[PDB]
Write a protein that holds these residues in place. Structure first.
Motif: not given
Lengths: 8, 99, 270
Positions: C116, C143, C146-147, C152, C156
């Motif tokens: 990203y 992020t 949190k990610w 998340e 993956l």
């Protein structure tokens, strides 16, 4: 395939 | 930030005066994606020029392959110009067909 | 050898007139194979390469669907970063991402990815030990916490080693002898007076696929450099490519030079 990205 | 295009004008095949060739322009390395691309025969903007799809690369930079047909002479002159936000005035590029 | 299945994505904020743009193109090796782009009559996630066009409506539809699901997902992301940074909604903003898996030299997983980057510059990355992430900037850290929180990162692993592979090979089978089949180059040189002390000679590598080659001027043994002008490599309409390299050779002493082009569909000695 494709991904279902999320979060940010 | 802003990466400044580095244009690259060139034919598809070789120049032979008479044979109806394709002059390409190919802009490289830019951010952000918006691009004013013009191809110009002796100062007078030829209008039939084809953008292709804009895609990026691992540096996070974009690239687009513009071009248009033509039929080269010693007389004629062909240039490409790019209007992008990193450079102020537009950078034109002249085609040397021994290059 | 091995293979790719990368997905490069772009979402741009077009403030004033226009709702955010969405583009996703899935490349195979360097062979471009799928796209989606919110700027089409029918904002479609349809083919590229004839081979993908030999599939049907559950790959198309769920995956046209799947993409649109991403359009909106991002267009929320754009508002968020904007926030993170404390940015004025005014100009464009650019969100990119590259995703994917490399198939090892035997049919399974030798590589796995997640990048990203916001407004050209790294934002997030997934670091290989497919569990650690790295916060590029001060606000990618946001992020992170949190990610990592929800799943998340872990969810993956699966896409990659799983779907991204499982799926990936169908492709590498249906367009088998298509995704490769080299393209033999054709070359020459073109002497040019520049002038009367010297004469620029120049090498023409043009008509190839893959995208790579390595040209050289060898003055009989010694491989020449500082005399070398290099064009860097570039596509030529047709999807052939081209390249050329040159030297400033003593007028007279021209023949004493050698032109060298080397590429994988060329059995070329010296």
């Amino acid at each position: 395939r494709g991904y279902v990205y999320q979060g940010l | 930030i802003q990466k400044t295009p580095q244009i690259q004008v060139y034919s598809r095949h070789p120049p032979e005066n008479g044979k109806p060739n394709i002059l390409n322009c190919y802009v490289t390395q830019f951010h952000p994606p918006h691009i004013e691309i013009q191809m110009l025969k002796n100062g007078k903007k030829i209008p039939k020029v084809e953008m292709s799809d804009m895609s990026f690369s691992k540096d996070w930079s974009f690239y687009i392959l513009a071009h248009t047909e033509f039929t080269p002479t010693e007389t004629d002159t062909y240039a490409c110009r790019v209007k992008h936000d990193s450079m102020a005035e537009p950078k034109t590029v002249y085609w040397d067909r021994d290059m | 050898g091995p293979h790719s299945l990368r997905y490069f994505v772009t979402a741009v904020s077009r403030p004033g007139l226009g709702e955010p743009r969405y583009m996703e193109v899935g490349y195979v090796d360097d062979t471009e194979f799928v796209r989606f782009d919110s700027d089409a009559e029918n904002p479609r996630y349809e083919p590229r390469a004839r081979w993908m066009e030999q599939e049907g409506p559950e790959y198309w539809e769920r995956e046209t669907q799947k993409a649109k699901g991403n359009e909106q997902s991002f267009r929320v992301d754009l508002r968020t970063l904007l926030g993170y940074y404390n940015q004025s909604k005014g100009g464009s903003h650019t969100i990119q991402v590259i995703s994917g898996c490399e198939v090892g030299s035997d049919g399974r997983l030798l590589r796995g990815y997640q990048q990203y980057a916001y407004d050209g510059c790294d934002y997030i990355a997934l670091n290989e030990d497919l569990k650690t992430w790295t916060a590029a900037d001060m606000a990618a850290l946001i992020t992170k916490h949190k990610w990592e929180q929800a799943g998340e990162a872990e969810r993956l692993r699966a896409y990659l080693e799983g779907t991204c592979v499982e799926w990936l090979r169908r492709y590498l089978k249906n367009g088998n002898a298509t995704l490769l089949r080299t393209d033999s180059p054709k070359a020459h040189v073109t002497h040019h007076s520049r002038p009367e002390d010297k004469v620029t000679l120049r090498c023409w590598a043009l008509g190839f696929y893959p995208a790579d080659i390595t040209l050289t001027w060898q003055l009989n043994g010694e491989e020449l450099i500082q005399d070398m002008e290099l064009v860097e490599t570039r596509p030529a309409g047709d999807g052939t490519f081209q390249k050329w390299a040159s030297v400033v050779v003593p007028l007279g002493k021209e023949q004493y030079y050698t032109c060298h082009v080397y590429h994988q569909g060329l059995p070329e000695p010296l």
